[PDB]
Amino acid sequence: MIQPQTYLEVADNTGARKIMCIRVLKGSNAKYATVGDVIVASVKEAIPRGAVKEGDVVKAVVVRTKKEIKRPDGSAIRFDDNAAVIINNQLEPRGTRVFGPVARELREKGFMKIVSLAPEVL
């Protein structure tokens, strides 16, 4: 589960590699997150030459979780990591090079921009 204290590496370029979770965006009490969850964040790890410096306070939505996901169809899956996709103050993935699998669940939520370039929808 995603408490506001967790590291969340990135499954994309953007100019980042790892972060830390700040809050979520659900109810002012929804202190827990999973797949496709709208999460605020402070990067704490960003590689030298990109468009988002290390530390910088920005937002994101999460996919690829250490916490298994149980669909409405009895099936399930857990990702070996806590990755995500980063966004701005206008909801859109900043970078472009998406790495690894993603949940098609998110696709019906409505973040198709990742899904389009997604190399492994799962």
Binding site: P72, D73, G74, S75
Partner: protein, 205 residues
């Protein structure tokens, strides 16, 4: 305002139409339609319903083999459905039709005297910085020197479990009269051998 008794077992997950669904299995069975109660000699309408037949030597006596028709009781004696009155024949299971939400009575399985942060869920706390003792203590209860009177129903550490309750909203797609079963959304309280009874929904009734 229809209904019929039931006994508890299993809760699986069969996949209807496409999706995957948790499924409570209760045996509704043949239940003796033993007599109605009438608003003059009572105050309302009610039907006594028996259940699963075994009662021989052990139960006997006034039987209500008296009653008006005999028939002999189950082994699960009998109860009543409020504001209820079928036709007059001993009804069974498929008194309802698949794909309908309804209500259910059940004996919540007992647990006994149990924890304060367990029964109600307090918070307690003090692991290492607090004290070894007051791990599972209610912390505080009252006030100072006014009002100073401990409140009735101060939510206390005690028995939890062996209760009884009705429950709303239960979708049943499955039912096997061919053995007398009823499979619903799945939530029913009680042990696998206790009291259950299906009454009709109240979404707007």
């Amino acid at each position: 305002m229809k209904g019929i008794l039931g006994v508890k077992v299993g809760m699986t997950r069969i996949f209807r139409d496409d999706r995957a669904v948790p499924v409570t299995v209760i045996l509704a069975g043949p239940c003796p339609v033993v007599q109605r109660r009438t608003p003059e000699k009572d105050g309302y309408t009610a039907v006594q319903l028996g259940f699963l037949p075994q009662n021989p030597k052990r139960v006997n006596r006034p039987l209500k083999g008296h009653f008006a028709k005999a028939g002999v009781e189950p082994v699960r004696i009998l109860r009543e459905i409020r504001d209820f009155n079928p036709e007059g024949d001993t009804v069974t299971v498929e008194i309802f039709k698949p794909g309908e939400r309804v209500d259910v009575t059940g004996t919540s399985k007992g647990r006994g005297f149990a924890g304060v942060m367990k029964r109600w869920n307090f918070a307690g706390g003090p692991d290492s910085h607090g004290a070894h003792k007051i791990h599972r203590h209610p912390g505080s209860i009252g006030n100072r020197k006014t009002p100073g009177r401990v409140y009735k129903g101060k939510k206390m550490a005690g028995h939890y479990g062996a209760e009884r309750v009705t429950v709303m909203n239960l979708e049943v797609v499955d039912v096997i009269p061919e053995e007398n079963l009823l499979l619903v959304k799945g939530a029913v309280p009680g042990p696998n051998g206790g009291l259950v009874i299906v009454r009709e929904t109240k979404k707007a009734a």
